Design an enzyme around this catalytic site. Sequence first.
Site, PDB file in Angstrom:
ATOM      1  N   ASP A 117       9.841 -10.407  54.428  1.00  0.00           N
ATOM      2  CA  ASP A 117      11.264 -10.353  55.029  1.00  0.00           C
ATOM      3  C   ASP A 117      11.958  -9.299  54.182  1.00  0.00           C
ATOM      4  O   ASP A 117      13.034  -9.624  54.072  1.00  0.00           O
ATOM      5  CB  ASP A 117      11.695 -11.634  55.211  1.00  0.00           C
ATOM      6  CG  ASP A 117      11.267 -12.576  56.142  1.00  0.00           C
ATOM      7  OD1 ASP A 117      10.269 -12.284  56.624  1.00  0.00           O
ATOM      8  OD2 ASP A 117      11.688 -13.765  56.323  1.00  0.00           O
TER       9      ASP A 117
ATOM     10  N   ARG B 149      11.435 -17.961  47.499  1.00  0.00           N
ATOM     11  CA  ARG B 149      11.415 -18.279  48.797  1.00  0.00           C
ATOM     12  C   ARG B 149      10.566 -17.231  49.719  1.00  0.00           C
ATOM     13  O   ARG B 149      10.128 -17.544  50.585  1.00  0.00           O
ATOM     14  CB  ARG B 149      12.531 -19.267  49.313  1.00  0.00           C
ATOM     15  CG  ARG B 149      13.342 -18.151  50.362  1.00  0.00           C
ATOM     16  CD  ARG B 149      13.765 -19.043  51.523  1.00  0.00           C
ATOM     17  NE  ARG B 149      13.063 -19.505  52.367  1.00  0.00           N
ATOM     18  CZ  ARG B 149      12.620 -18.859  53.627  1.00  0.00           C
ATOM     19  NH1 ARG B 149      12.479 -17.825  53.758  1.00  0.00           N
ATOM     20  NH2 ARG B 149      12.562 -19.884  54.781  1.00  0.00           N
ATOM     21  N   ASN B 150      11.153 -15.979  49.376  1.00  0.00           N
ATOM     22  CA  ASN B 150      10.591 -14.723  50.251  1.00  0.00           C
ATOM     23  C   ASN B 150       9.476 -14.009  49.726  1.00  0.00           C
ATOM     24  O   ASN B 150       9.096 -12.937  50.025  1.00  0.00           O
ATOM     25  CB  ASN B 150      11.794 -13.848  50.603  1.00  0.00           C
ATOM     26  CG  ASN B 150      12.875 -14.455  51.618  1.00  0.00           C
ATOM     27  OD1 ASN B 150      12.513 -15.136  52.545  1.00  0.00           O
ATOM     28  ND2 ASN B 150      14.089 -14.293  51.359  1.00  0.00           N
TER      29      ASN B 150
ATOM     30  N   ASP C 288      17.811 -10.045  49.815  1.00  0.00           N
ATOM     31  CA  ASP C 288      17.941 -11.660  49.520  1.00  0.00           C
ATOM     32  C   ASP C 288      16.574 -11.845  48.923  1.00  0.00           C
ATOM     33  O   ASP C 288      15.492 -12.708  49.311  1.00  0.00           O
ATOM     34  CB  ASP C 288      17.875 -12.179  50.785  1.00  0.00           C
ATOM     35  CG  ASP C 288      18.206 -13.629  50.473  1.00  0.00           C
ATOM     36  OD1 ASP C 288      18.446 -13.947  49.404  1.00  0.00           O
ATOM     37  OD2 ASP C 288      17.695 -14.517  51.392  1.00  0.00           O
TER      38      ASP C 288
HETATM   39  C1  LIG Z   1      -1.894 -18.539  57.056  1.00  0.00           C
HETATM   40  O1  LIG Z   1      -2.416 -17.778  55.871  1.00  0.00           O
HETATM   41  C2  LIG Z   1      -1.165 -19.570  56.528  1.00  0.00           C
HETATM   42  N1  LIG Z   1      -0.124 -19.670  56.293  1.00  0.00           N
HETATM   43  C3  LIG Z   1       0.649 -20.676  55.575  1.00  0.00           C
HETATM   44  C4  LIG Z   1       1.933 -20.815  55.210  1.00  0.00           C
HETATM   45  C5  LIG Z   1       2.839 -19.966  55.380  1.00  0.00           C
HETATM   46  O2  LIG Z   1       3.865 -20.241  54.822  1.00  0.00           O
HETATM   47  N2  LIG Z   1       2.414 -18.614  55.934  1.00  0.00           N
HETATM   48  C6  LIG Z   1       3.352 -17.567  56.016  1.00  0.00           C
HETATM   49  C7  LIG Z   1       4.745 -17.857  56.459  1.00  0.00           C
HETATM   50  C8  LIG Z   1       5.226 -16.675  56.566  1.00  0.00           C
HETATM   51  O3  LIG Z   1       6.745 -16.603  56.837  1.00  0.00           O
HETATM   52  C9  LIG Z   1       7.273 -17.789  56.925  1.00  0.00           C
HETATM   53  C10 LIG Z   1       8.618 -17.376  57.854  1.00  0.00           C
HETATM   54  C11 LIG Z   1       7.838 -18.196  55.688  1.00  0.00           C
HETATM   55  C12 LIG Z   1       7.728 -19.664  55.703  1.00  0.00           C
HETATM   56 CL1  LIG Z   1       6.985 -20.702  56.571  1.00  0.00          CL
HETATM   57  C13 LIG Z   1       8.201 -19.903  54.426  1.00  0.00           C
HETATM   58  N3  LIG Z   1       8.668 -19.436  53.283  1.00  0.00           N
HETATM   59  C14 LIG Z   1       8.963 -18.034  53.493  1.00  0.00           C
HETATM   60  C15 LIG Z   1       8.548 -17.409  54.626  1.00  0.00           C
HETATM   61 CL2  LIG Z   1       8.802 -15.784  55.147  1.00  0.00          CL
HETATM   62  C16 LIG Z   1       4.544 -15.423  56.680  1.00  0.00           C
HETATM   63  C17 LIG Z   1       5.162 -14.122  56.940  1.00  0.00           C
HETATM   64  N4  LIG Z   1       5.804 -13.232  57.187  1.00  0.00           N
HETATM   65  C18 LIG Z   1       3.234 -15.289  56.556  1.00  0.00           C
HETATM   66  N5  LIG Z   1       2.537 -16.518  56.086  1.00  0.00           N
HETATM   67  C19 LIG Z   1       2.274 -21.941  54.795  1.00  0.00           C
HETATM   68  N6  LIG Z   1       0.777 -22.636  54.997  1.00  0.00           N
HETATM   69  C20 LIG Z   1       0.575 -23.926  54.523  1.00  0.00           C
HETATM   70  C21 LIG Z   1       1.049 -24.324  53.053  1.00  0.00           C
HETATM   71  N7  LIG Z   1       0.345 -25.456  52.452  1.00  0.00           N
HETATM   72  C22 LIG Z   1      -1.102 -25.171  52.255  1.00  0.00           C
HETATM   73  C23 LIG Z   1      -1.885 -26.124  51.570  1.00  0.00           C
HETATM   74  O4  LIG Z   1      -0.863 -27.105  51.003  1.00  0.00           O
HETATM   75  C24 LIG Z   1       0.115 -27.812  52.079  1.00  0.00           C
HETATM   76  C25 LIG Z   1       0.676 -26.681  52.782  1.00  0.00           C
HETATM   77  C26 LIG Z   1       0.172 -21.802  55.494  1.00  0.00           C
HETATM   78  C27 LIG Z   1      -1.293 -21.827  55.822  1.00  0.00           C
HETATM   79  C28 LIG Z   1      -1.981 -20.881  56.216  1.00  0.00           C
HETATM   80 BR1  LIG Z   1      -3.765 -20.914  56.808  1.00  0.00          BR
END
Ligand SMILES: *C(=O)c1nc2c(C(=O)Nc3cc(O[C@H](C)c4c(Cl)cncc4Cl)c(C#N)cn3)cn(CCN3CCOCC3)c2cc1Br
Length: 300
Positions: free
Chosen positions: A178, A164-165, A160
Amino acid sequence: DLPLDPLWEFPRDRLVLGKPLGEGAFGQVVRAEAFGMDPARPDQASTVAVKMLKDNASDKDLADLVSEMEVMKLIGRHKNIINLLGVCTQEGPLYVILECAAKGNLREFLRARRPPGPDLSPDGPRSSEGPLSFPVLVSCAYQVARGMQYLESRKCIHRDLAARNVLVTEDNVMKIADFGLARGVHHIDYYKKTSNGRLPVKWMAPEALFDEVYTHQSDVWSFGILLWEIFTLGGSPYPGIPVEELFSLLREGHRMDRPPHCPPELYGLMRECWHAAPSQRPTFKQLVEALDKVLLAVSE
Ligand SMILES: *C(=O)c1nc2c(C(=O)Nc3cc(O[C@H](C)c4c(Cl)cncc4Cl)c(C#N)cn3)cn(CCN3CCOCC3)c2cc1Br
């Protein structure tokens, strides 16, 4: 409960759980602070992503997460994938500690950085200039390809692959997330739309959708869709086409149109990735090389 693996095991009391980042088919991911992830600096703090079971933890959920843990141990380290940092398996809930990508996934990253529209009043010398430029978009595509090439070398299939991944770090480094996960490929609801409106069926290669066959070449198809996402700046593929119509269009061999502001080189790559015969699609190695030539050509 699980056997102790001193290689990867990390003291859970050295974790400080923070705000949840997102939730998946099985398990959720929580932002957390880690102390002494580097054993040479025991009191040093770092930000990590902790994967754990939800609270509706079925034993299949645990099995899937345990499975993901073992894949992460074997895949090795690469710049362009989410790497395993450690695990917590002893005396407490199962934790899978992964690298954290500060800028979220590639789709959200691109959508938040679309150029200013003609509705804005010119303020300063850069009014028309948006955050995203062509060479950077090409670099994003190149990094995903390099990461996928690495995963392929480790005999791993994503199944997949999508914007988004793909996760974006503080330094705009692409990290595939993932990758070798259980995704229930024998019971996919092709009409299932996610909470954010995604129809995952639009990323599946024909042989995967129709014949339930997954190869590295089926990932290449998905990479083609990802290419389209990138150069639409986070657009949804097959615009305005419901799943029912997608079925018939694919059977007729329909492909997406060339998106605006997209050079013929890259749309060419997309169409190659969407060749019906998997053997007539480029390999990830060839994709890396092809995207490298473009990247070097626009990096004067
Ligand atoms: C830490 O570095 C950190 N991470 C994030 C993320 C974020 O998405 N981190 C993240 C997500 C992960 O997997 C999840 C399940 C995921 C998501 Cl949430 C969304 N899409 C795909 C996946 Cl796989 C993984 C893994 N494995 C690792 N890291 C998002 N933010 C905030 C985003 N943004 C920041 C500034 O603008 C406003 C919002 C963060 C922040 C931080 Br510090």
